[PDB]
């Protein structure tokens, strides 16, 4: 499948709290973003997850990160969540979330790891970590996989690099610490989500 | 076990059509090749593999590429198909494969992935992609797996990076895009093969 | 957990003599291992082993390396061996281990694979080959895997090089070639343990 979203690109937010939440969200957002999610590693992400959904879940995809459990999938299915983002495959855990009608980009780092994830039904892949792979390893995956997966990358992708995560065939990336890290102002969030926007239009342009 | 071919080197002729096929198998084996795969995602691979099998098989292993179903180990066999490559890890996959009498070598990248796969009686592995990892990745594993097993460097294999596969321990490389890439002439063919076994020739003397 | 000894770096002897056990131990020892392993594809480990656990076990961690199954660790019990190793990730042979009370540091070289060790009770990691990788992926993982998992790198790690392991959060190494090699002087053993141990206390202290 394509990506089901205008921009394929996720905002992740570790480590933020239910008091900063709607402002940073707000601040993705407003510079085109339209995929957010929240790891469950954050303090109280039972609190700004559900407070999220209702706010912006009208006009993004908004989940979870770091879910490694099955029951997890259940407790975020009441609360709204409609995207879940992992470190690991995990066969269940895709399956539950994939039953509910959610989006799952499960991360995973070899080819045997990702026809795995594709058995349990994701609709996306998240190649993790990125950056001690380089772009070839990506491409390389690409030609072995169906032609049409939408492949992310996650681990430290920069407005710099991005361009390259491109080439090398991906539909996006995950946008981490580079994007947010906790105790950041919204200012530097609204500077590094224009940012990245910004030199992804430049990449698909080229 | 030791490789049961003269040479070493998978020729991978991805994309190519049956109306190209003879030509093109004809060219690697002239060139001293005798260990040929057409992967799966190729156009009418139920005309090539079979046409081959008659054609060449009588002096070269000819095998198939990109296998991920036990029922298309089921096809492959009433083919005459001779050799298993895969991108990934399955053990049913191999277990089926080993139990037509076939020579399989299929795709790893971690440890744990190749000592999986030589459960299930692969006589062979492939690490995939090997051009990201580098040699030294696979010197570490070859100092960990059993002595006497046969591995070959997939991914980004070139006649002026082949030796140092060796220097590493490689048996030796299946050879992809840098061999064969769809709509190529049969004197690029015939160019690139007798390249690759020269470099080869060189780096086993070295 | 936390490392339960006083120095987080384990000594590996692969391909000792039992003639020569005593010797090079009693030198890594002095210089102030208090962590070591036989890999089961040295030479005569079954007597090595037992004598080394009668010798120094009070005042050290006994173990061993390269341990592929199930059987090879209830052979290692009677032994009064204290400490598994491994290659790869075997659930089987992890759960085995912790409930013979042994310390087990299983190798994994994904967030898949590491997942996957912790289920099965591991107290620590190992992350191999690590030299490929480099620092950056081991950080990557840190900040996905609980906080307080002891993560060792394994795979070309050298006094030079030990410094930026430590940076990127390993509580240790486990210690090759680079400071054992089959046949070296016990001399040999005594420089390269020194220089390790002096390299980890600058490497903390910064």
Redesign the interface.
């Known amino acids: 499948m394509q990506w089901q979203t205008k921009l394929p690109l996720i905002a992740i937010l570790r480590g933020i709290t239910p008091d900063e939440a709607l402002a940073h969200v707000g601040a993705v957002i407003d510079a085109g973003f339209d995929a957010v999610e929240i790891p469950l590693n954050s303090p109280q992400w039972e609190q700004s997850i559900p407070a999220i959904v209702d706010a912006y879940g009208d006009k993004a995809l908004i989940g979870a990160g770091?879910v490694?459990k099955p029951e997890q999938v259940d407790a975020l299915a009441r609360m709204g969540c409609q995207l879940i983002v992992t470190?690991?495959?995990?066969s269940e855990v895709i399956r539950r979330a994939v039953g509910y009608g959610m989006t799952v980009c499960p991360?995973?780092?070899?080819?045997?790891?990702?026809?795995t994830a594709l058995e349990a039904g994701a609709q996306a892949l998240k190649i993790?970590?990125s950056?001690?792979?380089?772009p070839?390893?990506i491409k390389?995956?690409k030609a072995?996989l169906p032609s049409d997966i939408a492949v992310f990358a996650v681990?430290?992708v920069t407005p710099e690099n991005l361009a390259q995560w491109i080439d090398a065939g991906c539909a996006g990336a995950g946008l981490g610490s580079d994007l947010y890290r906790a105790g950041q102002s919204v200012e530097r969030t609204a500077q590094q989500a224009a940012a990245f926007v910004k030199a992804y239009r430049e990449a698909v342009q080229l």
Chains 1, 2, 3 share one sequence.
């Open positions: 770091t490694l470190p690991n495959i995990h991360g995973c780092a070899t080819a045997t790891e990702a026809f993790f970590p950056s001690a792979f380089g070839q390893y390389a995956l072995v681990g430290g």
